[PDB]
RNA sequence: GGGGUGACCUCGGAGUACAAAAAACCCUCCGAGUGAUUUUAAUCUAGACAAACCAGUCAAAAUAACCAUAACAUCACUUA
């Protein structure tokens, strides 16, 4: 029985922004802030504010507000970065900056001679190579860019076999540090994707189980 | 005038009594037993009993502990036992549920601190 | 010479009454240095 | 020449035989600045409706935290069983790759990691100017 | 799962009042920090990252 | 090389227990990694000269 | 001289080596429960009950009485679960339990007690007071 | 008694003991102890994540060597006032660090653990999983003024 | 292990003296000739340990005052 071996790379880009809070978490945050303010002793700002409000009240018969107004005007003048960068495009599904609240993974489109599969980045290696080094060379030559990836461990994350004579594919997970993807207007269809759109796109049964070892978040 | 079991002194709790109150507070139910010196349970009140389970919600809380204390006090008055000892841990004696259980048992007529043996 | 004071009688620490002995109130059952 | 070296090594050994007590942490100790505002803080006078809604919120939060812990542990168990299946498949296929994969890579010692932010970084942003300095205490 | 260990408070008895200040580093991103002196935002500057050449370049461009 | 006196000398003087010579040996009676050895058919003392 | 134990030793089952990976009880109450559960087992050595009258240990008591009432355990558990769910669905009971201000219908409790489990408590109380020992022996 | 079958029934000192280099064998790579540092400007958030990772290790049965805190680093912000040629005080940032020291971990379980930590990482916290070395041990100690002066006058 | 010189002379702990008790040497080692604190810790009496004697040790019940539920003063290897 002949055996074929293949490694595969699953690159995760982590979320750059925090997810919004569930209303339960918002109520909990309000309650926690309230009880923290209650159990608090005193702040120097409110202490000097009350000191001034008392001394002026007793002096008219015989500032902290300015600093607060200055800080409020500075906060109103300063504009923060837009947390939403996808609701304005709604067209670009291959950009690295697509989603910021969730973690994304990369899918490549490949049309072989006998199979047309929306397949995760795979590779081939001779018995003289390691699986981690195989995935490294894969991300080096196939992606066609200088991106820095952080490998978690040497042990494989997923294993999938199929017999025709058999073949095995071992999926290794990797984390993205920074990606400088050059030649973005190419024909090579690479897409950054979250879990729901993975479940939407991935047709095959061997690749529909990536959600088993991929975190849901 | 019966012979109490004086003795151990090194182990806890002391076995010098005729009847002994034992409160077991599990994570679900509360069980208050009145055992004899031989170990047999004379009269018991448990939150696992249907009579208190159907009449009480949250069979673990302080309300349930006080309830089982009242029921045990009534059952002890019925059985004719008026004196028993209670030897709780230093952290169980300062709790809120056990304090209310002791208060309810005392108000129900069952008084702790078994009488001294005549000619001990 | 150098080693002094090693002379001391035994304190008779032992078990006085064995199992089955009929004793009376106040009879010392056993004496001990540590809790045996 | 030699007596000086003797005294030097002696003082070295004496200082080495000393204790190695740690730095007191300024977080766990309360400064003296917090001893004059405790009498000026007024109470809260929490009302009954707020107390009841706080108790209900605490019970809901306990339930939600329990459910979150359960789902997180379920995901951990799924990942762990997938890892065990992969390792068993590797052991069945070839022992050499399993042996060289069951070890730790030499690139994992300086593992650095940073969490998310409240807003994504702004392109072409410039901090105006300013220098930094450390005013942390010293101890001997 | 980023909001797992976020919903907490100060678990000490004697402490001053802290406020949710928005701190922006030299990247364009902001974070929420518990800090006294309730300034609605704090800015992190930089003058020691690059060398003397880029320092003089920035000084001339400013 | 074996040292004549251990790195920490025993300051307290001990009795000469001859039971450590009397009787059969219980330790170091089987081979560990080699194939030949010197077997002792009697009891005695080995000092730095030996 | 050494003798072999006439049965299993008490602490011979847990592994002596690698004690750090073994779970410990950090609660005096946990240890007390474990000890009181282990003390009620019929050990092969001289114990306290054997000398101070366990009353011949286990005894096959002859039952001279009416059979227990044959009830449907499944329907009983179903209606009990339904009653408990109905009791927990309320909000005033929860408010009372939280405020620690709740009373108990002691009369109904006693009625249900003598209806379902009162007979067994009375039986054990009579066994303690020695009624059967002097009436049927 | 010694000759009785109940000998050693009170034997208890073997049940409790009351009186780290990396172990790499290729397959059972149970390396030495590891230090997980969580650094943040928010003391409350740092303590919260320290408690969270400690409880996670306790649930995952990872032997936690220690759970301590490093000395706070207080930086002073000096901003350039407008029109140049000045440096005025803006605020002070107190940066805290909580370190959990765990003993043993395998490659697979370590990968899963880093996965979980980096997935549950809150905002504004630096996570650093390093090996416990001599400099990491000496960082939470005091100044050796006399000792370094002695080394200087010796050299 | 002749006297002289030297050393020791009383009390307690460990080994000698492996498991009831006892057991010597100018045998091997630790110590004591009291400190600190407050709960300032009584009278009377069964029955016992130990012991040549002198001495040393425990102690139920009953009595007066404090909780109306303890009082053996505690710690320093507590034994001296
Ligand atoms: Mg002696
Ligand atoms: Mg003698
Ligand atoms: Mg049933
Ligand atoms: Mg002679
Ligand atoms: Mg002389
Ligand atoms: Mg005698
Ligand atoms: Mg008395």
PDB file of C-alpha atoms (C1' of nucleotides) and ligand atoms in Angstrom, chain I residues 4-8, ligand 5:
ATOM      1  C1'   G I   4      50.481  11.636  91.795  1.00  0.00           C
ATOM      2  C1'   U I   5      49.150  15.344  87.735  1.00  0.00           C
ATOM      3  C1'   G I   6      44.954  15.972  84.613  1.00  0.00           C
ATOM      4  C1'   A I   7      39.378  15.226  84.523  1.00  0.00           C
ATOM      5  C1'   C I   8      34.902  14.342  87.158  1.00  0.00           C
TER       6        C I   8
HETATM    7 MG1  LIG J   5      43.548  17.500  90.816  1.00  0.00          MG
END
